[PDB]
Design a protein around this ligand. Structure first.
Ligand SMILES: O=C(O)C1=C[C@@H](OP(=O)(O)O)[C@@H](O)[C@H](O)C1
Length: 168
């Protein structure tokens, strides 16, 4: 089972925090998006575009559930995984770190050329705010630790996480 599971919007720092946490803990990082691509032989973009979000979510839930059983390192979940009830259920009992980010900073961090089916222009900020509004209670419901990634540089967020993982 993972030492920690990271959840949060695109742009919250899952990749960067997950790599730095994994290194600090002496374990590997598993990103469920990557796992999906590996198990399907398909890009995430392709799954959304051809088969649709609903089929993606069932796929994702399967992979997340497997990863929670089988991965012993740091697990990073795709931003929308917590929209699946079965994901939220499977997270019960785990250490779950919610990376919280303002809409302004999250938007800024997602404005590159990564393909993001649910966060494309135009009006990407409106889309980001709508994802944040919808998913915030869901992140909160599953989280065991909540961490602000706003401004705070990554090194310091990781330090804060390790500290909170360790003490009562
Ligand atoms: O927000 C979402 O619903 C999604 C987030 C992505 O994960 P990251 O947060 O790792 O980019 C990926 O699973 C897919 O594009 C759907």
């Amino acid at each position: 089972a993972p030492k920690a599971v990271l959840v949060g919007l695109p742009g919250s720092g899952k990749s960067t925090i997950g790599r730095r946490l994994a290194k600090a803990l002496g374990v590997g990082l598993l990103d469920t998006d990557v796992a999906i691509e590996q198990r399907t032989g398909r890009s995430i973009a392709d799954i959304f575009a051809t088969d649709g979000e609903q089929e993606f979510r069932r796929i994702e839930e399967d992979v997340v559930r497997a990863a929670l059983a089988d991965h012993d390192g740091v697990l990073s979940l795709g931003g929308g995984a917590v929209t699946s009830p079965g994901v939220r259920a499977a997270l019960a009992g785990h250490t779950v770190v919610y990376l919280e980010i303002s809409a302004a900073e999250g938007v800024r961090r997602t404005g590159g050329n990564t393909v993001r089916p649910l966060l494309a222009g135009p009006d990407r900020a409106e889309k980001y705010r709508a994802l944040m509004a919808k998913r915030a209670p869901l992140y909160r419901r599953v989280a065991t630790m909540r961490v602000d990634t706003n401004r705070r540089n990554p090194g310091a967020v990781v330090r804060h996480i390790l500290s909170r993982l360790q003490v009562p």
